[PDB]
Paper text:
The protein belongs to the αβ-hydrolase superfamily and is related to the bacterial hormone-sensitive lipase (HSL) family of enzymes as concluded from structural similarity searches with DALI. Here, we present the crystal structure of the carboxylesterase LpEst1 from L. plantarum WCFS1 at 2.05 Å resolution. This structure revealed that although LpEst1 belongs to the bacterial HSL family of enzymes, as otherwise expected from its sequence, it represents a novel topological variant due to the presence of large and specific structural features that decorate a canonical αβhydrolase core. Additionally, the esterase forms dimers in the crystal and in solution through an association mode not observed yet in any other αβhydrolase enzyme. The structural homology found with enzymes from the bacterial HSL family permitted the straightforward identification of the catalytic machinery of LpEst1 as a classical catalytic triad with Ser174 as the nucleophile, His313 as the general base that deprotonates the serine hydroxyl and Asp283 as the residue that increases the pKa of the histidine imidazole ring.
The four independent molecules of the LpEst1 asymmetric unit are arranged in two identical dimers, consisting of the pairs A–C and B–D. The independent molecules are almost perfectly superimposable with an overall rmsd value of 0.42 Å as determined with PDBeFOLD. According to the analyses with PISA and PIC servers, the subunits within each dimer generate an interface area of 1130 Å2 and interact via 19 hydrogen bonds and 24 hydrophobic interactions. In summary, taken as a whole, these results demonstrate that LpEst1 is a dimer despite the relative low overall interaction energies calculated at the interface and further suggest, that the apolar interactions are the main driving force for dimerization.
Residue numbers in the entry:
A (entry chain B): 0 to 337
B (entry chain A): -3 to 337
């Protein structure tokens, strides 16, 4: 049972902006109470240690309650293209429609995470939209740093395009997975493929290791009530630390994080970029760079929708058994596919 | 730790010197029902379970299916043999990228004395290594009935000697789950009786402290597990399965010349607990072995040994390796890592 929320839709700089409050009494500037109860640790500041294994040990989401069950089949398979073998968690709903497929890259700061972290979210989407979904186990840094994950995405696309000449691909992902999928999409387009007709981006990293004293990383953009301000500061500060650490893992010495294929925000042209829906929390430290990305698309005359979830932080979407806003994301995506 | 998980409000009390930490499965429910994630795995227990009493089936049922591994190559996993006391014992050796000196973790997997493999808890241990920067011996110890008691025990002894002769400064933490915990506890006891003091800690995950205890006695009384009416049948059937399993496994473990009530088969029945190292026990509310674990913790505390007893509400037996299934499993990893640094 989901709430009846009065969202606010405006158009800012060509971007369709949809702001969804966490309830009908509070319009912004505080955490959703469900979220807040998870942030207790952020009463104190955190020092991110910077070792691979410790970082990875926090990137495993325990099984999310699964209401879909047998109505969607989840199986592993390997696909091969461009001399790359990439493992995918393949989701198949009942009564599959053709010529629409969703490719999804999980988050995990380029070095971690597992596709299982968002299986249940994707089962919701496949069940509603009757579309098959590729939940991809893409290459991870630093063992397989950039552009390994990108090339995996390219192989997946080639595979899909050669399998069927009529199937339309929607690319999606959360956080750093979205970043990688966006680059792969760019690369796919620069080779002449037009089969990717849509991006669904959940709080994407669009500018890894951006200036932490610049406007993309400025706490002044996150007004919040006094009692939650220390928590917000420490929370934002943790991600500031992560942003540096993760980009170091992702980018090898020969490459640079400010390049277009590492930072989609810095692409020189956005005219080939497909129609895009971005979903992100009010208090996600990556929110500003997501918004900057959206503005860039709209200015290039690409249809762009930016849904902001008030009171929400980073990485919330797969937690469909915790937040109505997660179920909402599931709905938005499904709707985008049918 | 990282991201989405509501803070659990645990309850710490001291009972007869035991530091008791009760961790509810959410902030709504305090006790007396299964955590729903556990509950959905217990459907078959609406009816009495059928145990196939043959070695091949029992062994097969002691093998955990693949668990998702978020660590990958960031912790090194090697097979090595060590030899001591004229025993060669295989170990899965876990090495993190920056290793702290001296502190080392020896772990014995569960599997009812006749079964299990170190691979059952590899991911759990990679988590522990990753957080603690400690090297870990995940030991392939002797299994019954081909190598019944005290073969596993002696394998433990051999490991300790290997480690202590390797360097004199190294501190050992012994750990294991279920029957694995039992065997490594006895080996620790033995190691101490020979005069070693290098083992400075036990981390026990739902240990079997008294194999084949009286099933009509207080350690096996269903009354000790209050639960809601809707889940009573399941609990009862689940508990009965383990009662039967307890008899069978002890039979395999204990050869005819020995006895299960002895101190080295049943650490609960040690005559003395004063050499016993500081200990942390982690066990589920609905683990059939919970009461015997509690009895052990009390004997420790009474011997003025620091004892912590973490009870995870709504959890059953053998949950810990399942780190992709239960937040409590990752919590166990965290508690262990904390105890090592």
């Amino acid at each position: 049972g989901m709430p009846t929320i009065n969202s606010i839709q405006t158009t800012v700089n060509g971007v369709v902006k949809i702001v969804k409050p966490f309830n009908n009494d509070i319009a912004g500037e505080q955490f959703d109470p469900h979220v807040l109860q998870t942030l207790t640790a952020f009463k104190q500041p955190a020092i991110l240690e910077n070792d691979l294994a410790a970082l990875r040990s926090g990137s495993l989401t325990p099984a999310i309650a699964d209401p879909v069950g047998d109505a969607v089949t989840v199986q592993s398979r390997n696909i091969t293209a461009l001399n790359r073998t990439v493992s995918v968690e393949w989701l198949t709903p009942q009564n599959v429609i053709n010529h629409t497929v969703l490719v999804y890259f999980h988050g995990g700061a380029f070095y971690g995470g597992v596709p299982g972290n968002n299986t249940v979210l994707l089962k919701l989407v496949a069940a509603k939209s009757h579309c098959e979904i590729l939940n991809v186990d893409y290459s991870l840094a630093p063992e397989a740093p950039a552009p390994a994950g990108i090339l995996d995405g390219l192989a997946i696309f080639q595979y899909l395009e050669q399998r069927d000449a009529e199937t339309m691909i929607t690319v999606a992902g959360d956080s750093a997975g979205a970043n990688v999928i966006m680059a792969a999409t760019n690369l796919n387009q620069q080779l002449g493929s037009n089969r990717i007709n849509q991006q669904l981006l959940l709080y994407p990293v669009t500018a890894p290791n951006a200036d932490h004293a610049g406007p993309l990383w400025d706490l002044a953009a996150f007004p919040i009530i006094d009692s939650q301000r220390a928590i917000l500061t420490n929370y934002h500060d943790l991600f500031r630390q992560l942003d540096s650490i993760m980009t170091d893992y992702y980018v090898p010495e020969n490459f640079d994080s400010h390049s277009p294929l590492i930072s989609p925000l810095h692409q020189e042209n956005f005219t080939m970029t497909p129609p895009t829906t971005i979903m992100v929390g009010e208090f996600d430290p990556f929110r500003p760079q997501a918004w900057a990305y959206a503005q860039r698309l709209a200015a290039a005359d690409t249809a762009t929708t930016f849904i902001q979830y008030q009171g929400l932080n980073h990485a919330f979407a797969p937690l469909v058994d915790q937040y109505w806003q997660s179920q909402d994301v599931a709905q938005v995506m499904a709707a985008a596919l049918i």
